[PDB]
Design a binder for this molecule. Structure first.
Ligand SMILES: Nc1ncnc2c1ncn2[C@@H]1O[C@H](COP(=O)(O)OP(=O)(O)O)[C@@H](O)[C@H]1O
Length: 317
């Protein structure tokens, strides 16, 4: 009586029932479940997530080298969430946030709750009190690395020179997740890479439903003079869709994730926009000869690149 595929399913089902939808899943599988998500502001990355954005009520971690593009995405999330009429809280602990830029990304700073904790404990706690209030859609934390314990913030000797930070970070998540689910608020934990872990990413890794690995990969020289930098995000972990997908998206200086950029990329691979010979075209239209000229084309003739986005939106989701 051995039938693998029938015996496998029964097992898989059990596996999912004992540990939750997504415990295990074939890699090239398509997903009925839409969740309800917060657009990552990166169409590519969105598809890359397989639900069109950051799932809600889950602990997300966006890690990666400095200036890779983590924040911007975390900020875009916020902005979107707020358009959907959601309230957002920024548990700042690095003091870098540029509200100005943030508004340019569409964030409504004036309605954005900001907190700058005195300690790691406080920082996580303050965020917990807010989470379980239920009034939030998304709550971003800046720099897991900065969630330094109190005994360390205050002057405490190199005795009980423990593995204390990550501890703090586990207990805090052990209880904040439960509420995030009940609350359905999405927690984006920005965790940045170092010197020479993060002493606190050890816990996260296991408590995060989604873990994006943000990376810098190119300087958009364009007309041989800097505009912005191209980014690549790997979805190393996804418990709401098949993991390991990949997306690339532009981020010009001063500007956030380039919509037209996205369009001209996703367009090409998905072939609605056919072009090569170092030139670009759509439905026979002369877009221009460099990704930039094109980006600009779309940026200007708003009408086009709208039917494209459309055309692309259809074929995917
Ligand atoms: N305050 C700013 N002013 C101008 N450009 C910015 C600013 N912050 C971010 N950017 C742009 O957004 C990109 C990503 O920034 P950011 O997300 O802060 O890097 P990180 O990965 O350390 O969080 C930067 O490379 C730059 O192109």
């Amino acid at each position: 009586a051995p039938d693998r595929e029938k015996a496998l399913e029964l097992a898989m089902a059990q596996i999912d029932k004992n540990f939750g939808k997504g415990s295990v899943m074939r890699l090239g599988e398509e997903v009925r479940q839409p969740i309800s998500v917060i657009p990552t502001g990166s169409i590519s990355l969105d598809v890359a997530l397989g639900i069109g954005g950051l799932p809600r009520g889950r602990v997300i971690e966006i890690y990666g080298p400095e200036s890779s593009g983590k924040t911007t995405v975390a900020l875009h999330a916020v902005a979107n969430a707020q358009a959907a009429g959601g309230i957002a809280a920024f548990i700042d602990a690095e003091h870098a946030l540029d509200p100005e830029y943030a508004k340019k990304l569409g964030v409504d700073t004036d309605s954005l709750l900001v907190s700058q904790p005195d300690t790691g404990e406080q920082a996580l706690e303050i965020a917990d009190m807010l989470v379980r209030s239920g009034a939030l859609d998304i709550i971003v934390i800046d720099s897991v690395a900065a969630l330094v314990p109190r005994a360390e913030i205050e002057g405490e000797m190199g005795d009980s020179h423990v593995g204390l930070q990550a501890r703090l970070m586990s207990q805090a998540l052990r209880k904040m997740t439960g509420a995030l689910n009940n609350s359905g608020t999405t927690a984006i934990f920005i965790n940045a890479l170092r010197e020479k872990t993060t002493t606190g990413g050890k816990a996260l890794k296991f408590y995060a439903s989604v873990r994006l690995d943000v990376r810098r990969i190119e300087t958009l020289k364009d007309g041989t003079d800097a505009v912005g930098n191209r980014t690549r995000v790997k979805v190393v972990k996804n418990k709401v869709s098949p993991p390991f997908k990949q997306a690339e998206f532009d981020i010009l200086y001063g500007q956030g994730i380039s919509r037209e950029g996205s369009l001209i990329d996703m367009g090409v691979e998905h072939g609605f926009i056919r072009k090569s010979g170092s030139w670009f075209t759509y439905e026979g239209e002369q877009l221009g000869q460099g990704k930039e000229n094109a980006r600009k084309f779309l940026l200007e003739n708003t009408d086009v690149a709208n039917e494209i986005e459309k055309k692309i939106k259809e074929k995917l989701g």
